[PDB]
Design a binder for this molecule. Structure first.
Ligand SMILES: *[C@@H]1O[C@H](CO)[C@@H](O)[C@H](O)[C@H]1NC(C)=O
Length: 381
């Protein structure tokens, strides 16, 4: 067929190429005679090996341009740019579509590094990140203690450049890093430790104690929490007894040679940086009984009613009971008879008879002590 002008069949395609690696910008054209190919970087002639065999750019018989390496530095940049191939034969000129030849880049320092988080168990946890500068744009991923982290958990959600934990479990604690990845490689960010702190609480709390005079007293107290909580005893109404207290290694409070006045309430206090827990117990000093009111010997006329007063005060409130001098039968606060004992301790004999004559013993007792006193009854006409 009679000679024809050039017609570009294949055009050069845009290309992003890794730091120092060969590149190929394809360009095929038809025409008779075979059209000579020339490359132009923004209109300027590209000096190839088919111009000077010292240039790192090679023009192929297939009309394609091969780059043996990519030149990108702080002083020179002759490979990066916009290219067009031109097919020229006996009569005619063909110009192709343009193509880009950009160097792939990925910097070191991050646009935003993940920061540490100190939360309580259950509180949500968020982590912010932005990858280091890079073209094409780097893709964000996360790692927990070397191993890669997944969105798989219902709570864990990775969106854009954020990490969200809806509720924290102790198991989420650890060292976290943000990974930026494009074609150049990977960049692992700065370590952002996440700590799951527990508020203070009591494993074993104090028990209310009743202890008599001169005996020692013990109040047990064990606490938990992360970080390990400091444990310190209080005295709600004053201070601890100088030279009479001792805080053991187990955290238990001991008051030696107890004397009334110690009688009150003591508090165990557990405290850490995330919270504070308190627990109370009372100490009961037990004083032996003493007679407020003692019965007095009295004469009652036949058939009338007599009351013998007996009132006592001790710690705890001491119980009271009567008994006739020779008898075994003990009289308490209610079968019924003419004899009765009031709640406060008084004995009342109703419709008296000559048989009722004699001493009536009053007896008070509590865990600490016991006291006795009597009074005579004289039945007359
Ligand atoms: C590349 O071709 C486009 C048309 O697709 C044109 O807009 C642009 O100016 C050309 N680029 C250069 C640097 O000449």
């Amino acid at each position: 067929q009679e000679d024809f002008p050039p017609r570009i069949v294949e055009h050069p395609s845009d290309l992003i190429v890794s730091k120092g690696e060969p590149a190929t910008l394809n360009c095929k054209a038809e025409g008779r005679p075979t059209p000579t190919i020339e490359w132009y970087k923004g209109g300027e002639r590209v000096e190839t090996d088919k111009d000077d065999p010292r240039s790192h750019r090679m023009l192929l018989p297939s009309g394609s341009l091969f780059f043996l390496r990519i030149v990108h530095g702080r002083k020179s940049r002759p490979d990066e740019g916009v290219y067009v191939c031109v097919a020229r034969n006996y009569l005619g000129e063909a110009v192709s579509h343009n193509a880009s030849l950009e160097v792939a880049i990925l910097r070191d320092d991050f646009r935003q590094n993940p920061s540490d988080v100190m939360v309580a168990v259950g509180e949500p946890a968020v982590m912010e990140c932005q990858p280091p500068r890079g073209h094409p744009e780097p893709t964000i991923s996360w790692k927990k203690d070397g191993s890669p982290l997944d969105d798989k958990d219902e709570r864990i959600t990775i969106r854009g450049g954020k990490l969200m934990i809806t509720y924290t479990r102790k198991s989420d604690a650890g060292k976290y890093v943000c990974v930026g990845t494009n074609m150049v490689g990977e960049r692992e960010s700065e370590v952002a430790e996440l700590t799951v702190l527990e508020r203070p609480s009591f494993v074993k709390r104090p028990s209310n104690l009743a202890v008599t005079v001169d005996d020692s007293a013990e109040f047990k107290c064990e606490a938990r929490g992360d970080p390990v909580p400091t444990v310190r005893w209080r005295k709600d109404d004053g201070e601890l007894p100088k030279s009479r207290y001792e805080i053991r290694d187990d955290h238990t409070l001991k008051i030696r040679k107890v004397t009334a006045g110690d009688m009150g309430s003591y508090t165990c206090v557990a405290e850490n940086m995330v919270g504070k827990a308190e627990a109370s117990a009372t100490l009961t000093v037990q004083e032996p009984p003493h007679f407020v009111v003692k019965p007095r010997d009295q004469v009652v006329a036949l058939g009338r009613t007599v009351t013998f007063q007996c009132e006592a005060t001790g710690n705890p409130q001491p119980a009271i009971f009567w008994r006739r001098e020779g008898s075994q039968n003990l009289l308490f606060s209610y079968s019924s008879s003419r004899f009765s004992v009031s709640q406060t301790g008084d004995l009342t004999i109703t419709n008296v008879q000559r048989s009722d004559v004699g001493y009536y013993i009053c007896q008070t007792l509590n865990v600490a002590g016991s006291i006795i006193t009597k009074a005579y009854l004289e039945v007359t006409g």
